Every structure is written in C-alpha cells, then in structure tokens.
C-alpha cells in the first residue's frame, strides 16, 4: 500500500476511502459482448 502519488488519480491507502457495497449498483464490467456471426454482422 506504499504511497505512489500520480500514476493513478487515487491512492489506495489514500485519505478517507471506503469499501461499502450497495444493493443498488451490482459491480460489473463487460463480459457478454455479442460477437456471434449474425449479430456482429
């Protein structure tokens, strides 16, 4: 967790972070991208 500083806009051990799940926003990237023949073109 050693301080970095600019590489990325947020420090991990940074001031006032906060792990806190909300039933409201179910974390998700993009897995189901459609590529099948008919659907991709």
Partner 1 sequence: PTGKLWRPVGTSVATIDSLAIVSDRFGQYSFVNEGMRETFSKALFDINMWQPLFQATKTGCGPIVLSSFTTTTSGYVGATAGDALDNPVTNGVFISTVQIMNLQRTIAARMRDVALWQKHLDTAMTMLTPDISAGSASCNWKSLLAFAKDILPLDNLCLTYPNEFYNVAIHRYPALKPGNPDTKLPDAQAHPLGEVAGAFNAATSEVGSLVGSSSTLSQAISTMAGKDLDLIEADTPLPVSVFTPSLAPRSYRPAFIKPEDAKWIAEFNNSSLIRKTLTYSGATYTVQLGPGPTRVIDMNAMIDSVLTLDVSGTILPYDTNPDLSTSVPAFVLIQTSVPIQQVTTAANITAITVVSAAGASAINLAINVRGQPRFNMLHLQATFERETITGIPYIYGLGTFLIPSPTSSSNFSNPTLMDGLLTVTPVLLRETTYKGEVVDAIVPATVMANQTSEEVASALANDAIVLVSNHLNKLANVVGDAIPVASRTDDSATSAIVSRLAVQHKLSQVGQASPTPPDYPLLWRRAKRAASMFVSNPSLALQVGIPVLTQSGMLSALTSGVGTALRTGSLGKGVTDASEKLRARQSLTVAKQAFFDQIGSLWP
Ligand X SMILES: *C(=O)CCCCCCCCCCCCC
* Residue 6 lies near a second copy (rule: CB under 8 A): no
* Residue 26 lies near a second copy (rule: CB under 8 A): no
C-alpha distances (whole Å) from 33 to each of 29, 37, 41 are: 10, 13, 14
What is the SS3 assignment for 40?
helix
Decide which of ligand X, a second copy, partner 1, none touches 18; Cβ closer than 5 to 8 Å per partner kind.
Answer: partner 1
Site for ligand X in 12-31 (CB under 6 A): 12
Q: Indicate the DSSP class of residue 37.
A: H
Which positions touch partner 1 (CB under 8 A)?
1-41
Which positions touch ligand X (CB under 6 A)?
1-2, 12
């Amino acid at each position: 967790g050693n301080v970095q500083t600019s590489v990325n806009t947020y420090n991990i051990t940074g001031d006032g972070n906060s792990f806190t799940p909300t039933s409201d926003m179910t974390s998700t990237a993009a897995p189901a991208i459609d590529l099948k023949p008919g659907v991709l073109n």
